[PDB]
Design a protein around this ligand. Structure first.
Ligand code: A1A24
Ligand code: CL
Ligand code: CL
Length: 211
């Protein structure tokens, strides 16, 4: 329905710019970071479901799917985790992300590298190592389905999403940069998952292209 546009916190915009502009070849770390976030979301619904089993009425299966689409030049990471509320998307996550962004930037000035971003809690933004645009479809039990989108440049949008219901969880859609299409290829995604995400406690299914 109505699209609302918001500015990132200045610190978050600055982090995104650093991610986009810094020469840094080891871009594959984005996948570990997004998988980690998906795992954390799954952990949360699992834990909440032990005191309120009805929280799984929106979907019992706790899983991560990684879906390449070469025709659309997208890599999608779908989880059936807890999902994000409207307040999470617009304000609350970025509020928390300020402190870790500051710590990370400081660590970079003192000699850390970009692969340490997850040690600071702000690994989502590493998506911009490979994506020109990120679309996030999300649904929490206590809210409606939303679509968040950002092509960086200091702004993001949020709108009620009337597309296909996802039930519960989050779908991170990476619109890949032209030179980052290796991350649509079978061997490559498998190699990266095996290297950095081997012990995640939820089934990770790596889909193949149909063509
Ligand atoms: N696949 C996912 N499923 C989920 S479902 C959910 C709610 N569930 C909560 C999530 C955070 N959990 C951890 C934590 O509270 C830890 N913490 C507390 N104090 C300091 N750190 C936290 C909060 C803010 C934050 F930036 C990182 C964090 F790790 C608590 C449960 C968040 C979430 N995320 C996620 C994780 C991360 C993020 C963002 C999103 N951000 C984002 C925002 C808008 C649009 C796109 C992405 C930006 C910052 O990063 C997923 O990708
Ligand atoms: Cl923000
Ligand atoms: Cl819930």
């Amino acid at each position: 329905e109505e699209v609302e546009t918001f500015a990132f916190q200045a610190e978050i915009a600055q982090l995104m710019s650093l991610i986009i502009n810094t020469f840094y070849s080891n871009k594959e770390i984005f996948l570990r970071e997004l998988i980690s976030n998906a795992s954390d979301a799954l952990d949360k619904i699992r834990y909440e479901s032990l005191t309120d089993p009805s929280k799984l009425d929106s979907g019992k299966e706790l899983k991560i799917d990684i879906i390449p689409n070469p025709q659309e030049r997208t890599l999608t990471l779908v989880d059936t985790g807890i999902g994000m509320t409207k307040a999470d998307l617009i304000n609350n996550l970025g509020t928390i992300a300020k402190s870790g962004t500051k710590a990370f930037m400081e660590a970079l000035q003192a000699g850390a590298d970009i692969s340490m971003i997850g040690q600071f809690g702000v690994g989502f933004y590493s998506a911009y190592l490979v994506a020109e645009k990120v679309v996030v479809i999300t649904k929490h039990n206590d809210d409606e389905q939303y679509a968040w989108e950002s092509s960086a440049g200091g702004s993001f949008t949020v709108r009620a999403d009337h597309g296909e219901p996802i039930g519960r969880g989050t779908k991170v859609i990476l619109h890949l940069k032209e030179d980052q299409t290796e991350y649509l290829e079978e061997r490559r995604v498998k190699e990266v998952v095996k290297k950095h995400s081997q012990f995640i406690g939820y089934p990770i299914t790596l889909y193949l292209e149909k063509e």
